[PDB]
Structure formats: C-alpha cells, structure tokens
Amino acid sequence: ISQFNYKQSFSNPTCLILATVPHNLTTITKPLKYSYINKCSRLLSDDRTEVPQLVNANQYSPCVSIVPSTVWEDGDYYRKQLSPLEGGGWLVASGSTVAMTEQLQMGFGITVQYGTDTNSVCPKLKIASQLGNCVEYSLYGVS
Amino acid sequence: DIVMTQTPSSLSASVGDRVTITCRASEDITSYLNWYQLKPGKAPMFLIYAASSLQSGVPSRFSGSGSGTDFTLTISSLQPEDFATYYCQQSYSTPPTFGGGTKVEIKRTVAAPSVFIFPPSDEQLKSGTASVVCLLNNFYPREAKVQWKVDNALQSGNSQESVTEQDSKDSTYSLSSTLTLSKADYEKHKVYACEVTHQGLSSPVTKSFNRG
Amino acid sequence: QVQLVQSGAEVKKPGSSVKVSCKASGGTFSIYAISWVRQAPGQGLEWMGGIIPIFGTANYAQQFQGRVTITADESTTTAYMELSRLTSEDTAVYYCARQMTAYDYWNPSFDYWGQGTLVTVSSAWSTKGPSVFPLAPSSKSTSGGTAALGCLVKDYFPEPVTVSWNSGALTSGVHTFPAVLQSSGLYSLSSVVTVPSSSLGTQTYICNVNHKPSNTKVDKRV
Amino acid sequence: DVLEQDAQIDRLINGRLTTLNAFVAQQLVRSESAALSAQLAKDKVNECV
Amino acid sequence: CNGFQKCEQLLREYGQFCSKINQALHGANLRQDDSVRNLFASVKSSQSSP
Amino acid sequence: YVDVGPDSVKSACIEVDIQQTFFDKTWPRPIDVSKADGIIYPQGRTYSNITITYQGLFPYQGDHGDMYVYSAGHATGTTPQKLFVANYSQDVKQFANGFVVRIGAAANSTGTVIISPSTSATIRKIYPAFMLGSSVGNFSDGKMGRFFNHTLVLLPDGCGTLLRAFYCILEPRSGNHCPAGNSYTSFATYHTPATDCSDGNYNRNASLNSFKEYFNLRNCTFMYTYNITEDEILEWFGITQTAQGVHLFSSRYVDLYGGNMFQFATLPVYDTIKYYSIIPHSIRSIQSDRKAWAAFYVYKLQPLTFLLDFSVDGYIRRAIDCGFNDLSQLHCSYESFDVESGVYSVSSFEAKPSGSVVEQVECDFSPLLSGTPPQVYNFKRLVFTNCNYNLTKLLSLFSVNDFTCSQISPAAIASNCYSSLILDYFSYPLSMKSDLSVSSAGP
Amino acid sequence: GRGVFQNCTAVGVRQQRFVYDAYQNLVGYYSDDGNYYCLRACVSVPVSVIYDKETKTHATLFGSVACEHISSTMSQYSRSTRSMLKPVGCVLGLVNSSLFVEDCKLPLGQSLCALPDTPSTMRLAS
C-alpha cells in the first residue's frame, strides 16, 4: 500500500485514521469491492532490465492512468506502451481486489502544515493587541 | 484554400476577334487578381494586377474587368503575337493560386489530316524493336482520336502521340502515333492498321499494311 | 529592368538534395521579394515559397516546410532554392519570380520570371551514349511518290541530345519527337524525315546523332 | 538503492565533517604555539646574535 | 562528497559547516603570514658588511 | 463539474500558418540576480535590512530562457484571414520544477513588427498562455502536442484585463482545421480587436471562445478568474507545484514596480504535472493596424541557494547565485556582498572519465528444479564461483510472493558482481512468512 | 574505480589480480592476461581566486603545479561549481591574468606566492 498506492510525508505532522460508519451515514455509497495496486513496474526495450516504480510522497501513482477506478479482479495486469518522448519501454500495473465488509471501513490521512503565511485554520470559539506591553500572545499560526 | 478555375480551358479565335477569358474564384477576392500571359518558351508576362488595371508595357487591347468572384480579361482585337496561355492568380490570401490556363488558336485553315504509315526498317529489325508510325499531317481542329488495330486486336498502352506547335502558316500540326512492339509480338502479326478520326476529316480512315 | 538568370537542368538520385540558383541583374535585389514557383507536368503552377534578401526571412509553402530551403546572397544578387528527398512527383520546371511590390511577401505579383530549370530524378543513371537505330525506307514504306526514312535515337542517360540530317543538309520533312521514359527509364526519341522515293537511290541518307554529355558523334545509314 | 543510500551517505558526511573539524582545531592550537615560538626567536636574534 | 552529485545535494543541508572550516583555516594561514613578516622585519635593518 | 458555458457551434476552425522562420530573433534578456530578476519571496516571512542565505526555487544566474513572441494574423485591406503562429503548440517542454516568465520587458519602446519587418510599431505588452498536463501524445496526424487527461489551461482574456485558469479535459474537434478534423495545421487562439476589444466593452469570453473553437472542454473541475489592470510595466509571473496544489505567483499586486513575485492563487491540481507548452495566440486585426508585442521569456526553476539582500521595505533588490562562479562562492560563504581582498582557495576541478576498462561460466540452476524442494530445516544451498549468471531468467519462471533485499538493492542483486553467490532453497508456506525474517522470535 | 593505468616492473606473488597498499587505493594487476598495469588514483587540479577588492578585478591562480594540463574553460575539467570560471608561465602554476611585468614591488600586497605580490591595477609576478 505504501510503495505503490498511497504514501505520506516523513517531514510533516500527520494523523492517519481508520474509521467506519456502522449503519447511520447511509449517504456514503458502498463500492463494488476494495481495490489496490500491488505492482506498478516498467520494462525497457532490452527485455532483461526491470524497474519497479515506487509512488512518491503525497502524490498519485504513475500507473493511475492505465488502471480503472475499481480493479476488476485480483492479480489483474494492465499494460501500456510509452511514447518515444517518454523513453518508450513498457508500463505494467498489477491490481488486487479485496472482498467487501458489511459496513464501510474508510481511511483518512490528515497532514497539517506549519508552513505558509496565507490565513490560518483554527478551532472556532479586550485581552488583545491594544494592551501590547502585557506579556503572552497567540497569532494566526505563531504562539 | 482558394481554388480558382478558368471557365474556358481553350478557345479558338482568329485575328481581329474580341476575346473574353473568365476566371472563377472559390471565395470573395475583393480586388486581388493577376492576369499573366505565358508563351511557351520564356518567362511569362505580367499583364493585369487587381483584375482591372493595365501593367505598363502592355497594349491597351488588353482590358481587365471584374470584382468579387467574377473576373474577365478582355482583348479588343486578337493579333499574331496575341496567341498565348492565360493564367489567373489570386493575390488575396497567402499562397498564390494560379488558374488552369487558356489556349488560343485560329480558324485559319480547317484541314483533314493526310494519313501516312511507316513500318520498321530492316536495320530496326536487327535492332530488336519494331515500330510503326502513323503520321497525320496538316490537320487543324485540335481534337482527333487515333487507335491501333493489329490483326483486329485493339492495341493500347505502348503507343505515344506527339504534336508540334502552330506552323503559323496553316494553323495545323503534324501528329505522330508512334506504336512500338517487340519481335515476339511483331513477327506473329500481319495487319498493322491505324484508325484515325478527325472532325476535319470526312470519315475515319485507316492506314493498313501487311508485314513483309 | 531585371534579369532573372536560371541554371542548367538537374538529374539526380531520388532522396538526394537539388540546388537551383537564380541570379537577378538590375533593379534593387535586397528590397524586392523573389519567389520559387514549380510547374509539374500536367499539374499546373505551384508556389513553393518566397524570400526578401534585406530581411533574410524566408516564406515557405505548408507542404514543402521542413524539406525546401530558400536562401539569398547579398553580394552576388543570387537567390537559391534547395529541395531534399527528391521524388518522381518532384520532377518539374522551377522558376524564380520577382514580386512587383517593394516589400509585402503576402501580396505577390510576379512581374519578372526566370527562363526555368528542369529537375529529373535518376535511379543511378550513368552518362552514356545514344545509338542510331533508325528507319530505312522500303517499297511498302513508300506510299505514293514519297516515303519517310528516320533516325529514331535510343538509350543515352542525360536528357540533352541532337539529331541532324545528312550533316545538317537535310531539313525537309524532318520531324523529331520528344524522348520518352520507359519502365527501364531509358531515353528514346524518334526523328522521321519525309523523303521522296525518287531520292532514295540517287541520295543516301545518314543522320548524325550528337550527345554532348557522352560526346558521341555517330553516323549510321538510314 | 535510493532510500537507504541517503542514510549511508549521511553517515559518511557526518563522519568526515567531524574529522575535518578536529583537524581545524588542532591546526589552530599548533599555530598559536608557533606564534609564541616566533616571538622567542625574535628575542634570541636580538639578544644573542 | 568526493565528486558525486547526490552527496553534494545532501551536503547542501550542512554547507555552513564547510564555510566555517574554510574561513577558519584561511584565517590561520593569514596569521602565519603575518608572523613570518614580523620576524623577518626584526632581522632586517642590519647593515651587512659585504 | 462546473458549467463553463455552451460549446462552440461553428463547423470549421480558422486556418493557421506556422512560419517559425519569422519568429526566430535574438533579443537576449538573461537573468541577472544583481538586480533580483525572477525572485520568489519567502512564503510566510518578511525581513528588514538583514542579508541572509536562503534556499528555494530560483532561476540560475545568467540563464537566457526561452523567448516567445505573438503576432497579428493575415490581413488584407480591411479583412482579417488566417492566424499567424509559431511551432510552440507542437513543441512539448517539461515542468520539472515550474518556471518564471518575464512579461512586457520591451514595451514602451518602438521596434519593427516581427510579422512585417518593414512596418515599425511601438512595442506593447501582451500576456502569455499556457497548457500544462501530465500526459502527452500526438494527434491523429502524428503532430505532437496533445494533452490526454485533465489538463490545466491558463489564458488571458479581454485584451489582457483578466486571467482564467481551468482544469478541464480537452477533446479535439472534427471540423476542418480543427485538431481532430482534416487539414489541421496547429491549434491557436485569437481575439479580434475591432469587435472584441471595443472601448469599455472588452469581451471577457473572446479568447475562451477562440479556444472552444478547437476543443470541446469536458468534466471541468474548476474555473478561476483574476482581474488585471492595464498598463505598460514590466512584470513577472511564476508557476510551481507542491503537494498543496499548483501555486501562481506575480509581481503585479505587491511589488508592481520592483518585480518580486508573491503568491496570489493556489489551484486544486494534484496529479504531478510533467509537461507544458505555450499556446500560440494571434491577434486578428487589419494590416494597417499591425502592432508590435513584447516578447515573453520563460526561465525554469532549479533548487538553489541564494544570498538575498533585504531592504528596510523588505523588498529584495540584490541577490547572489551561490553556485555561479568562484567569487559567488566567496560571497555566499562570507554571507556578505563585500569580501576583503585576499587569495582564497575555491573548489577544484576534476577530470572526466572515458573508456571503462573491463576484464573477466554459466552458473547452473538445474538442481533447483528437479526433485522435491527440501524442508526449511533440510534446506539445500547452491554456491556459485567461477561462473557468470542471469537472475531475471531464473526468476521469470516463478511467481515471487516476497522480494526483500537488505544491504542490497533488488536491481543491484541482478547486476553487481562479487566473489561468490549462495542460493539456499526449501519448501516454505506463505502462512509463516513473518517467521521468515532476520529479526523475529519465531522458531 | 577511476584511475590512470600504466605498465610497471614485476612485484608481488602474481597469483592474485590486485595489489594493495593497506588502503582502498590499489596498484591493480594486469588489465589483459600476461601483462602488468600498475594503477593510480585519478588526479585533480586545485584552483584559487584573488579578489583584489580595491580594483574589483579577479585573477584565477591555479594549483602550485597546474601549468600544462589545465586550459582556460577546458572541456576535460568539470568543477563542482556551474563550471563558469572566475597565462604567466609556471612560477606557481598557470594564472588567468597574464602580465610578466615585475619592475620593483614594495612589501605590502596580497603576497600570493613566494616571489609574486600581484600589485592592484593584474600586473602579477613582482
């Protein structure tokens, strides 16, 4: 899952949640089955040099274009040729299916960043800048 | 692209004859047409620009008329040096597109072709290529149809037709139907007949001869 | 007045590059635009491109782009066209045409044209001599008071050739026909002369075939 | 491969940087010693020669 | 980073250390030069009989 | 899926010419950091008099970039005809780390129009247009320049008064000259100033209509519009890609007169952009009003360390590219724009290799195949010495469930050479895979 | 590895193909059977820059012995820097500034080398 489907950033505060809706939030619509990619590789024109392609951090898989939204069967293979501009060779992606559970089990990945300026995202809720001399302050993202 | 067609591809007219040439334009060319004169054998002559105005050094007998898509170069009187191919070229958009071309001739003499036949020579036989030539001399109407019947077999694909330019004396030419065969297909045939049809000729005539 | 002087006809291998030079004498060469127009036999006049020497920028037809190159020389007042990957369809007569407008490549009137340069493709075609394979007369070749005895001409690989009659003395009834190309791609033309039968015996007829590239001066009896 | 070669090259980088800093430190010490010796030599030249 | 591009990319995160090393060592050499110049000046001013 | 508007109804697309020879000029405007050309400001900080080193995405010092130029179209007397464009649409460039664009540098001066050199017009500012995407191919004709899936398109509209950004799927059209149709030269975009650019009534869809002529945009995730004041001032633009989306920078709002770029938009695009190209734009006017348009220069962004001088205003007016030459090394190392005179040692050259010399049968794997693979406690090995081998050939005959290489890479273990190979095999269920590890307490 | 190869007088058991000096660098045996190829670590050229701040001119002194192989903007030498760079005989290697004038020079100055003092306004070697 990490090296071909979804990888997060080693350099950012992250929280990863595996949750589920028991029966209430019926608005979420169940899919066909669970799908993931177990292999997304590449072969050169020599037939004797194979290159697996790990997914980059917080990006899409390179083989996303040749894979449908839901993989039809486990062990399925998808092949596509590459243009001479992009080096040619061959793009091969391996799918995998997982039988579905009774209730939807969902996954969330939250990455906040203590980085940019912009505005600020915070919880909603006279001790203010007017009394500047008094010590202690909390800004848009600086405390 | 602007494709331009000359409505007449060839007109025959003696000297002292008013002549109008029509060029058809695919799209509105507001005032961008050129009339060019081409006598086979030299750089052509720039006659008219914008379809109406006379290039300097051109007789006033040439006149330009037209606009939009109708265009007609007009010659007040034909002259011995007025007989040449005429091309209409648009100056409106991007690549110059040239009209088809128009041929000029005269009714000077309407003459039937005098038909001759000449078989291959004995030395042209030692050569290995046998060639019968049917010659039509001094025939004016440009249209003529020539075919070959070798032993009542209609020959095609191996005879070529040549013609000269205006003799300037009789408005007729010399036409050669040069029919070429090899010994494997020549010595096995006896009759060698050329079927010539000309409107100036009364009836289609034949030069028939027997080999040997 | 302007003189547009072309160059000699070209015979080259298909896929080879052909260079054609047109020289302008008189007028102002740098300001005026010179355009190359090709007449393919039976295909009509086709515009290939144009160039203005002072600007140095070359206009090109869409189909010829990436193959044809148009250049001009300021010092010698000469306009040059180069075509790569020659094909059977390419064989044509090429004309350099000056444009009347001082500038404005887009609006073109060709006031002056070159005489023309012929281009032919040659599949490893070697310069050799022609052969006299004429047409002697006979009784059955004699219809009426006159027959026709000719020179024909056969199998020389460069386009120019010259058939004369009785060392140039015979000029009556001489009819020469354009050389055609066979599937073997050789050069073959005919030249028949209408000679009275009475002159068949009293006069013996020999046609001189002259090929300048092969430098062949051959007399064989007709 | 890449992911682990980053860690390996980092190990080498840190090691070499530390040795090079040690080199600089001992050079500073030894240079100071030589400066004091040079003052002594100046005194010996003025006094003995 | 004996010449290898990857190593230099990694070293980019440390480059200030290399700068400190270079500057310190350059200053040490300058101080050596001053010491030599000073000692030789004391030797100078001696009117040598040929 | 946002509603962009009605499709284009016209059957055929306007004809286009590609005279790449007309656009080939040499007007060098290289980057020079001594006056802070193409600098992106720190995203959340500002500073004062201080001078600091800072590592980010910058264009390398002295870079010439790529020059692009726009022109009028074929015009007869009062009638416009075919558009004039270069080969920019066919050419495919790579969005390695984004790029910075110099806009209207030649404006406020008079230069000969590129389309008609004899004609001379006062240079005026024009804005670029870009297509960016993740997948590229050719059209039906083999003409390069087709963007397959969702592709971001940025184009100016209303004679340079607004910018539109949208992330749509572009499918060509089958009319004449339209890219899926016949007689197709190159897609382009255009606006006719006689009607579209009337005073106070700038058609804000004119260029969008031109674009819709050639493509049927579908499944548009979003569309954004940004207003732009008219003037003739040099300005900068920038594009970059992060995990947060694509970022758009400009000098227009914050440092209009200085050129520092500040972010003004973030766009929800999350497939890695690999390719981009410049949309050719022809101005559909009459030849009597052919105007000259300032060339725009595109410089790629490279990770780099830059010594940045900050004014009391905080604006960067001076920078050093630390990797340009040796004197730049000195400036960056002393972290100052002034270094004392002296003799400083810098980084040394080193020679280049050539002609890799090599000197050096048939490592067999037959017993791996014949018989019954013994137990994991009766496992049997194959040592290899005095032979050469290929591992892919062996491994393609089976279905490898796990391939984990420690202290070695899966590619290297197929390509590197060494003294001796040891290959031990046995019969192992996939149930006890976890027990088969170097660090495990399993039996 | 990267390193010059040469032929040298026979030493060592000769059973192995590698001779070592107790360090990673090695003499490296016979490139082709029945021959000897003594090997060397790849050589590198040192470079130094004289700022000359008052003039603001820069002079590229090369290594103490870098006056034959090195050439201005040489294709062979690829520096770690963008290869953008910044000649008097061989006093101490080649130098980009090329003035042989010495005349008389006073003690104060860069003092780049043993003899040379490079007085301000280039004009090396004095």
Contacts of G122 (CB under 8 A, 6+ apart): G52, G55, G57, G59, G97, G99
**Alpha carbon B42 to chain centroid distance?**
18
Are B108 and B14 in contact, with CB atoms under 8 Å apart?
yes
CB nearest E8 (choices: G80, G107, G111): G80
CA dihedral F354, F355, F360, F363 (to 10 degrees): 80
Q: Which of F333, F334, F346 to mutate to test the interface with E (most CBs of E within 10 A)?
A: F333
Q: Which CATH architecture has domain C3-121?
A: Sandwich (2.60)
Contact with chain F for residue D3, Cβ under 8 A = no
Instruction: Please give, rounded to a whole number of angstroms, the shortest distance from the CA of F41 to a CA of chain D.
Output: 30
Chain F residues near residue A69 by CB distance under 8 angstroms: none
Burial (CB < 10 A; 0-12, 13-18, 19+), residue F51, is middle
**What residues of chain B lie within 8 A of the CB of C61, using their CB?**
95
* Residue with the two structure tokens 């092949």: A79
Q: E with D: 3 or more CB pairs under 8 Å?
A: yes
SS3 of chain F: the string is CCCCCCCCCCCCCCCEEECHHHHCCCCCCCCCHHHCCCCECCCCCCCCCCEEEEEEEECCCCCCCEEECCEECCECCCCECCEEECCCCCCCEECCCCEEEEECCCCCCEEECCCCCCCEEECECCCCCEEEECCEEECCCCCEEEECCEEEEEEEECCCCEEEEEEEEEEECCCCCCCCCCCCCCCCEEECCCCCCCCCCCCCCHHHHHHHHHEEEECCCCEEEEECCCCCCCEEEEEEEECCEEEEEECCCCCCCCCCEEEEEEECCCCCCCEEEECCEEECCCHHHCCCECCEEEEECEEEEEEEEECCCCCEEEEEECCCCHHHHHHHHHCCCCCCCCEEEEEEEECCCCCCCCCCCCCCCHHHCCCCCCECCCCEEEEECCCCCCHHHHHCCCCCCCCCCCCCCCCHHHHCCCCCEEEEECECCCCCCCCCCCCCCCC
Which residues, including other chains, have CB under 8 Å from residue D25's CB and lie 6 or more apart? none
The encoded tokens of residue G59 equal: 């002079």
Q: What is the chain E residue with the closest CA to F304?
A: E12
Residue found under tokens 């990797």? F323
E36 contacts on D by Cβ (under 8 Å): 38
Q: Which of chain F's residues have a Cβ under 8 Å away from the Cβ of A8?
A: none
| Contact list, F409 vs chain D (CB under 8 Å) | 1
Residue with tokens 């290959």: F423
Of C132, C134, C153, C133, the residue nearest C195 (C-alpha):
C134
> What's chain D's length in residues?
49
Could you tell me if A73 and F431 are in contact, meaning their C-beta atoms sit under 8 angstroms apart?
A: no
Which residues make Cβ contacts (< 8 Å) with residue G50, sequence separation at least 6? F341, F342, F343, F344, G58, G59, G61, G110, G112, G118
Cross-chain residue pair A65–F149, CB shorter than 8 Å? yes
What phi-psi label fits residue C218: left (phi over 0), alpha (psi between -120 and 50 degrees) or beta? beta
Q: Which residues of C touch B116 (CB under 8 A)?
A: 143, 148, 194
Give the angle subtended at the CA of F377 by the CAs of F371 and F380, to the nearest 5°. 45
The topology (CATH level 3) of C142-221 is: Immunoglobulin-like (2.60.40)
Of B97, B94, B101, B84, which is closest to residue B33 (Cα–Cα)? Answer: B97
Task: Report domain extents, chain B.
Answer: 4-105, 114-210
CA-to-CA distance for F20 and F114, rounded, in angstroms?
Answer: 11
Contact A88, A47 (CB under 8 A): no
Place of tokens 């033309």: C189
HEC profile for F203-260?
CCCHHHHHHHHHEEEECCCCEEEEECCCCCCCEEEEEEEECCEEEEEECCCCCCCCCC
Residues of chain E found within 8 Å of residue D28, distances taken between Cβ atoms: 24, 28
Under DSSP, the state recorded for C167 is: T
Residue C120 to residues B17, C123, C157, G79, Cα–Cα distance (Å): 41, 10, 11, 56
Residues 90-109 of A with CB under 8 A from F: none
Q: Which residues of G6-23 are buried (b: 16+ CB within 10 A; e: fewer)?
A: eeeeeeeeeeeeebeeee
Q: Are E30 and G111 spatial neighbours (Cβ–Cβ below 8 Å)? A: no
Q: Report how far residue C121's alpha carbon sits from residue C91's, in angstroms, rounded to the nearest whole number.
A: 6
Q: Copy the structure tokens of residue F307.
A: 């010594």
Subunits touching D (CB < 8 Å, at least 3 pairs)?
E, F
Separation of alpha carbons C164 and C219, rounded Å: 10
User: CA C117, CA F98: separation in Å to the nearest integer?
Assistant: 53
For residues B198 and B136, the answer to whether their CB atoms sit within 8 Å is: yes
- The shortest CB-CB distance from G53 to any of F62, F341, F346 is to F341
Q: How far is F418 from chain D (nearest CA, A)?
A: 17
Rounded to whole angstroms, how far apart are CA atoms A43 and B11? 70
Using a CB–CB cutoff of 8 Å, tell me whether B9 touches chain C: no
Output DSSP code: residue G105.
-
Short-list F176, C102, C40, CA closest to C48:
C40
Q: Quote the CA–CA distance of C93 and C84 in Å, as a whole number.
A: 16
Distance CA B147, CA F40 (A): 84
Confirm if F61 and F31 have CB atoms less than 8 A apart: yes
Please tell me the CATH code under which domain B4-105 is placed: 2.60.40.10
Distance CA D2, CA C210 (A): 79
Q: Which residue of F has its CA nearest to B92?
A: F76
Nearest CA in chain F to B95: F17
F77, F286 in Cβ contact below 8 A?
Answer: yes
* Phi, psi values for residue B161, rounded to 5°: -115, 130
Q: How many CB pairs under 8 A join B and C?
A: 102
How do strand C112-113 and strand C117-121 relate by DSSP bridges? unpaired
Mutation target vs A (from F40, F41, F43; most A CBs, 10 A cutoff)? F43
C44-51 vs C34-40, strand pairing mode: antiparallel
**Residue F190, burial from CB neighbour count under 10 angstroms (0-12, 13-18, 19+):** buried
Which residues from chain E sit within 8 angstroms of residue G80, using beta carbons? Answer: 3, 8
Residue F101: CB atoms within 10 A of its CB come to 24
> Across the interface, do E11 and D6 touch by the CB < 8 Å criterion?
no
Q: Is F182 on the interface with B (CB under 8 A)?
A: no
Q: How far apart are CA F116 and CA C52, in angstroms?
A: 11
Q: Do residue E23 and residue F345 have CB atoms under 8 angstroms apart? A: no
Residues 6+ apart with CB under 8 A from F198: none
Residues from B contacting F (CB-CB < 8 Å) are 30, 32, 92-94
Structure tokens at C47: 């515009």
Instruction: Give the C-alpha separation, F339 to F329, whole Å.
Output: 11
Residues of G in contact with F344 (CB under 8 A): 48-51
Nearest in space to A62 (alpha carbons), one of A8, A4, A1, A10: A4
Q: Find chains touching chain A: ≥3 CB pairs under 8 Å.
A: F
- Considering only the beta carbons, identify the residue of B46, B119, B174 that sits closest to C110: B46
Residue A58, min C-alpha distance to chain F (Å): 6
**Min distance C58 CA to chain B CA atoms (Å):** 13
Q: Which of F332, F335, F344 sits opposite E26 (nearest CB)?
A: F344
Nearest 10 degrees: Cα torsion E14, E16, E22, E27: -150
Sign of CA dihedral F422, F423, F426, F429: positive
d(CA F255, CA B196): 90
Residues F104, F293: Cα–Cα separation, whole Å: 8
Of the candidates B69, B38, B64, B68, the residue with the CA atom closest to the CA atom of residue B51: B64
- The minimum CA-CA distance between G39 and chain E, rounded to whole Å, is 19
Whether chain F has a CB inside 8 Å of the CB on D1: the answer is: yes
Burial of F380 (0-12, 13-18, 19+ CB in 10 A): middle
| Interatomic CA distance for residues F238 and F97, integer angstroms | 11
Please state, as a whole number, how many other Cβ atoms lie within 10 Å of the Cβ of residue B199: 14
Taking a C-beta distance cutoff of 8 angstroms, is the pair F260, F36 a contact?
A: yes
Longest dimension (CA), chain G: 64
Residues of F (52-81) whose Cβ lies below 8 Å from B: 74, 76-77, 79, 81
Burial class (CB in 10 A: 0-12, 13-18, 19+), A45: exposed
Fold of the domain built from segment(s) B114-210: Immunoglobulin-like (2.60.40)
In angstroms, the CA F241 to CA F276 distance is: 13
The SS3 assignment for D19 reads helix
Counted residue by residue, chain E has a size of 50
Residue among F319, F330, F317, F332 nearest F59 (CA) = F319
In chain C, ranges of CATH 2.60.40.10 domains: 3-121, 142-221
* Dihedral (CA of F205, F207, F209, F215) sign: negative
Contacts of C104 in chain F (CB under 8 A): 116, 118
What values do phi and psi take at G97, rounded to 5?
Answer: -70, 140
The H or E element that residue D44 is part of is helix D2-48
Minimum Cα–Cα distance from A116: chain F residue:
F44
Q: Answer yes or no: do E10 and D5 touch at CB < 8 A.
A: no
C65 with F118: Cβ contact below 8 A: no
How many whole angstroms separate alpha carbon F262 and alpha carbon F254? 7
Helix axes E16-43, D2-48, angle to 10 degrees: 10
Distance in Å, alpha carbon of F326 to nearest chain G alpha carbon: 5
Query: Is E27 touching F (CB cutoff 8 A)?
Result: no
Helix (H) or strand (E) holding B210: strand B205-210
Q: Which single residue is written with the structure tokens 């302050």?
A: A137
Q: What is the DSSP string of A23-83?
A: SS-TTSPP-SSEEEEEEEEEE-TTSS-EEE-PPPTTS--GGGTTS-SS-SSTT-EEEEE--
Enter the tokens of residue B112: 């039937």
Please calculate the CA angle A49-A54-A60 and round it to the nearest 5 degrees.
130
Same fold: B4-105 with B114-210: yes
Burial class of residue B42 in the structure, from the number of CB atoms within 10 Å of its CB (0-12 exposed, 13-18 middle, 19+ buried): exposed
Answer whether B178 sits within 8 Å of C115, measured CB to CB.
no
Distance CA A1, CA G95 (A): 59
Compute how many other C-beta atoms are within 10 angstroms of the C-beta atom of residue F416: 9
Question: Among A10, F51, C84, A90, which Cα is nearest to D7's?
Answer: A10
Percent of chain C as helix, strand, coil, to the nearest 5: 0, 45, 50
> F371: which residues sit within 8 A by CB, 6+ positions away?
none
**Helix pair angle (F326-334, E16-43), 10° resolution:** 100
Contact present, B and C (at least 3 Cβ pairs less than 8 Å): yes
CA angle A96, A101, A106 (to 5 degrees): 80
What does the block give as tokens for F222? 């979003």
> Residue D24 and residue E21: Cβ atoms within 8 Å?
yes
Q: Would the CA dihedral through B23, B25, B31, B35 be positive or negative?
A: negative
Considering only CB atoms, C136 lies closest to which of B44, B97, B121, namely: B121
Name the residue with tokens 């656009």. Answer: F23
**Subunits that touch chain E (at least 3 Cβ pairs < 8 angstroms)?**
D, F, G
List Cα–Cα distances, B208 to B134, B149, B153, F23, in angstroms.
Answer: 10, 9, 13, 69
CA A57 remoteness from chain centre: 8
Reduced to 3 states (helix: H, G, I; strand: E, B; else coil), residue E29 is helix
Contact F66, F329 (CB under 8 A): no
Shortest alpha-carbon distance between residue F63 and chain G (Å)? 12
d(CA F236, CA F36): 11
